[PDB]
Amino acid sequence: KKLVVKVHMDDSSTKSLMVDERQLARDVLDNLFEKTHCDCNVDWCLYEIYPELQIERVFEDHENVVEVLSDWTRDTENKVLFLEKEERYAVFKNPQNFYMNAKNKEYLLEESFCGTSIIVPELEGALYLKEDGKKSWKRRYFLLRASGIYYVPKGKTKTSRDLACFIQFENVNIYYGIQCKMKYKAPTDHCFVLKHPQIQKESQYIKYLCCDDARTLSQWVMGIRIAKYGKTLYDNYQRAVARA
What we know:
Elements: E1 2-8, E2 14-20, H1 25-36, E3 44-50, E4 55-58, H2 65-69, E5 79-84, H3 90-93, H4 102-113, E6 124-130, E7 137-144, E8 148-151, E9 164-168, E10 173-177, H5 180-184, E11 190-195, E12 207-211, H6 214-229, H7 231-241
């Protein structure tokens, strides 16, 4: 299987590439680096836009391009952009901002990514969860874990015995939600979205989460990406640095 992928540039030009089943985002980026003669910095990425849903996310570099794009409908408005998103590897540049001199940064990342298991940032706090099909939001206290977003049930304790799972990351991508304040009466526009890659239109299965703060959004998007992708994210970063 092969797809023609139209990659949309910052200057509104487009580059069409023949992409076979074996190509990762990493390979498409390498191709674009050669064609564009860009500085090859670590922030350059493929970036998926859903115009209809008004959601968007970075492709991770290890992701299979055909697999991602095969979820798109026949009449899709979805686009792939080539752009700089300095948020994508923020944790690797500045681990102190999620978990400083170079030596202490290196020690922190070694501790967090190079052990037997990944150490996810100790992230917890209240977010607003959108009610399914309604312009209505509910404040809920959430806890980040490697496997998913967890919560304490009413009358229970904050322990591994009692923690209940809201959502697992395994079958869900994380996206930025755009204009959720206007569309759905979100308290703010600092929103992220969890949905199965296969969902391409309006659906109750899409989960909308609003943060009070721009900082809170940044913490949660980075944190969930660390949790979902784990060591692969670190490997992705190492591969990117070698090209810069």
